[PDB]
């Protein structure tokens, strides 16, 4: 794997010795080049994995997430190029350094053949994010948001460390291959119940599960644009990836320990979808949409059937790309408007037609329109849950209808209607924003042609 | 839409509005022209029989059962003109009205076409630039202390003066811009 | 009731300015300027570049690629009646048993 | 090419209530003692080519005569040709 990790590390000296007016160009070019290198990992085989060495291994679950992580960084740089114009060279270089460190930690996390190394990098991914949120944030609530994001995650993930070291003491190894091959059933006991809770809660808090999602709207609203996309696209998938990796040792306890979380997610999807309808903010609406989709992913993972896992992976990738696009569009609107309110600027389609087209495409993809991978993952999870129980279809259909409703409400309120009269600084959209939207959307419509690349190991 | 409203409607205004609404809904009920004329004349007759009443308590006592009778027979699907706030084409062209200030963001290559229009545009902009400075002072000196009491704006009084707050009323896009 | 003198004067001046602005919206003969720069027959070419070429491409794709794999194109077997002859075998299907025919 | 021909409005004295069913309205208003000031304003709806109206049944059989003639001709031709 080192052919990927080493260039990401070399991105730091490359950035720090660049000229004052050429950091963005170099960072973007070499990030894109790195993404091309990461494409080779996608060719997985039906057998075990691509066991590179004793420390790193790649599966067909890690490959799509790794490619998405490597692809996101150029988009983050193009998004951050706007509001960092009046920033000193040292602070811009520090921002790029934080982004590069985040990418490096995520890359090392997603392979992480050993569970303790996975946990170490999984918590290491928390420092650059907190620095980005609390330093380059506009509102005065970024401090409280950073505190919430830190503590909600750390409180859940601290018992996970104890559970992992206990498992190593009893089992004798935490390597995922040995863990998978030597797995033994968990007896129904209070100690095993608490081991299950410790191993699960750390990933359920980050997903997030309904009832522990309070940190997500704050972190997404107060963060800068790049922090928002990296939170919505990749950082939410860490919990689901960890849960799908670690549910291999919790059987057969899960068969009855999944009921509270299944009920919480299947009701919180409806609750957050309804919340999206009555929202005065755009970024908050998108954050709640992300919560709903991640609740569906939680249900899929807890069902634990092959179709559930395939749909979960597809929905992970699709939601990451869609949420990143939606946050990009909201940021472009906010930069001209400087208000971040849904009804303050209206009828923008008459003034910016191409951005209206991008809004329509993003809303349609979020609406789970066929044959996009959004609906592929959605439908796989729906069929798996229907096999689990015939009554889930009611909740899932209600969620689908409310999702369509709030997506088209978001489109209509900001694009259709009569323009607001007292706003006269809606300049024509730059080439940077159009290119950003195109690079967000084209991979989705391209992946809809080859779904097997994002359907996970149980394909 | 043009005229500023008053704090309240007099009894005469209420009577006139009720008369207009009643005639409109009667026309909606009576599809044909001769029937409409006959029943409109009958309604006018029954409307003017209390024209010369003097006391206001009884007049206010009337125009209440009149409103109740109107509400009972209001033809729940009245006729609405296509451009009315209930018509079939009410806000049909509101998506074609592009504001004037958008022309300030045009590329110079786009401004190369239509040069005379943009020259007249610069002349209008200069006119507005001077007129605003005059109007702010005129309105400041004309308004009574404590803030305006009604939203009626005064006309221009001097020779070179222009009416206060005219730019966004004069430069409306069009009725049918496209 | 009716217009107050101030209202009449303001409306008159606003109308004058509005008419001036509207008249200024007109385009002169040379107002639109375009800079020029370059780098049966209609239906005859249309049927060639829009109908014939798709037929060729799709026929090639179906004949030599889709039908290469088994069971891709499956046709309902034609109806066989009494009295017809089969091309592949040449055998003749026996007729009916001469049901009684009145009216 | 648009509709620019300087159309001229007709004379206002042409429109009269005479020959229209507005007489019945005027007469029944005069019986109870009133008049319709706007009677002439709509006389144009009953004056020109709009004067003659067609009943619903007559509207349905718009081309009955020509169709019947063609049908009779065709039936006769078929009769005289098949009888051979």
């Amino acid at each position: 794997m080192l052919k990927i990790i080493i260039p990401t590390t070399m991105l730091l000296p490359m950035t720090w010795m660049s000229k004052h007016n050429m950091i963005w160009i170099n960072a973007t070019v070499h990030s894109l080049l790195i993404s091309l290198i990461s494409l080779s990992l996608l060719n997985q085989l039906g057998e075990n994995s691509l066991n590179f060495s004793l420390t790193f291994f790649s599966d067909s679950l890690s490959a799509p997430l790794l490619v998405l992580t490597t692809w996101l960084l150029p988009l983050m740089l193009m998004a951050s190029q706007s509001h960092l114009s009046k920033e000193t060279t040292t602070r811009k270089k520090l921002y790029i350094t934080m982004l590069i460190l985040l990418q490096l930690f995520l890359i090392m996390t997603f392979t992480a053949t050993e569970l303790i190394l996975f946990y170490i990098l999984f918590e290491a991914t928390l420092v650059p994010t907190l620095i980005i949120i609390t330093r380059w944030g506009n509102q005065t609530e970024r401090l409280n948001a950073g505190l919430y994001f830190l503590f909600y995650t750390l409180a859940g993930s601290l018992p996970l460390l104890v559970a992992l070291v206990y498992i190593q003491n009893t089992t004798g190894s935490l390597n995922f291959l040995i863990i998978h091959y030597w797995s033994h059933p968990l007896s129904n006991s209070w100690s095993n119940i608490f081991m299950w809770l410790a191993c699960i809660m750390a990933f359920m808090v980050k997903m997030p599960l309904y009832g522990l999602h309070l940190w997500l709207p704050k972190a997404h609203v107060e963060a800068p644009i790049a922090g928002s996309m990296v939170l919505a696209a990749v950082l939410l998938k860490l919990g689901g990836y960890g849960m799908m990796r670690i549910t291999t040792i919790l059987n057969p306890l899960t068969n009855y320990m999944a009921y509270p979380f299944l009920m919480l997610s299947m009701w919180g999807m409806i609750m957050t979808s309804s919340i999206c309808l009555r929202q005065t903010d755009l970024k908050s609406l998108i954050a709640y949409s992300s919560v709903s989709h991640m609740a569906l992913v939680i249900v899929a993972i807890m069902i634990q059937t092959p179709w559930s896992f395939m749909g979960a992976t597809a929905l992970m990738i699709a939601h990451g790309l869609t949420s990143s696009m939606l946050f990009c569009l909201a940021n472009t609107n906010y930069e001209r408007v400087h208000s971040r309110t849904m009804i303050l600027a209206r009828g923008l389609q008459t003034l910016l037609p191409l951005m209206a087209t991008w809004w329509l495409v993003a809303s349609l993809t979020n609406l789970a329109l066929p044959p996009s991978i959004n609906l592929i993952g959605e439908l796989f999870i729906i069929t798996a849950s229907f096999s689990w129980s015939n009554i889930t279809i009611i909740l899932m259909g209600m969620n689908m209808m409310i999702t369509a409703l709030y997506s088209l409400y978001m489109l209509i309120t900001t694009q259709r209607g009569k323009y607001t009269h007292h706003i006269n600084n809606i300049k024509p959209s730059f080439t940077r924003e159009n290119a950003l939207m195109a690079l967000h959307i084209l991979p989705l419509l391209l992946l809809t042609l080859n779904p097997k690349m994002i359907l996970g190991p149980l394909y | 839409a043009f005229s500023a409203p008053a704090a309240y409607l007099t009894h005469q205004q209420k009577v006139l509005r009720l008369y207009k609404r009643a005639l409109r809904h009667l026309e909606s009920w009576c599809v044909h022209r001769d029937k409409y004329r006959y029943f409109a004349c009958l309604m006018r007759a029954r409307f003017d029989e209390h024209k010369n009443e003097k006391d206001m308590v009884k007049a206010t006592q009337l125009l209440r059962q009149a409103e109740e009778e109107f509400w009972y027979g209001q033809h729940p699907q009245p006729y609405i003109f296509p451009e009315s706030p209930g018509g079939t084409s009410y806000e049909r062209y509101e998506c074609y009205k592009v504001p004037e200030w958008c022309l300030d963001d045009w590329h110079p290559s786009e401004k190369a076409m239509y040069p005379d229009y943009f020259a007249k545009r610069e002349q209008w902009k200069r006119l507005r630039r001077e007129s605003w400075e005059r109007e702010v002072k005129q309105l400041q000196e004309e308004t009574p202390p404590g803030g305006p009491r009604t939203e009626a704006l005064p006309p221009a009084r001097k020779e070179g003066d222009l009416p206060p707050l005219w730019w966004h009323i004069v430069t409306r896009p069009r009725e049918r811009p496209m | 009731s009716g217009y107050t003198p101030d209202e009449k004067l303001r409306l008159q001046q606003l109308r004058e300015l509005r008419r001036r602005w509207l008249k200024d919206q007109e385009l002169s003969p040379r107002e639109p300027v375009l800079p020029p720069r370059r780098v049966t027959y209609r239906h005859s070419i249309f049927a060639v570049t829009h109908v014939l070429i798709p037929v060729w491409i799709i026929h090639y794709y179906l004949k030599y690629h889709v039908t290469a794999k088994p069971y891709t194109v499956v046709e309902r077997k034609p109806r066989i009646f009494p009295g017809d002859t089969i091309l592949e075998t040449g055998e003749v299907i026996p007729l009916m048993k001469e049901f009684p025919d009145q009216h | 090419e648009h509709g620019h021909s300087k159309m001229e409005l007709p004379d206002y004295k042409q429109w009269k209530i005479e020959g229209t069913p507005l007489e019945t309205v005027q007469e029944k208003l005069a019986a109870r003692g009133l008049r319709d000031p706007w009677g002439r304003n709509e006389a144009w709806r009953y004056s020109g080519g709009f004067a003659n109206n067609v009943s619903f049944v007559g509207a349905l059989l718009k081309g009955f005569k020509w169709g019947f003639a063609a049908f009779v001709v065709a039936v006769g031709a078929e009769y005289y040709l098949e009888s051979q």
Binding site: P353, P428 | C102 | E26, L27, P32 | -
Partner: peptide, 14 residues
């Protein structure tokens, strides 16, 4: 008829 008007529209060049 020579009554061509100017159609105000946003900059479609970009």
């Amino acid at each position: 008829h020579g009554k061509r008007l100017f159609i105000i529209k946003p900059s479609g060049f970009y």
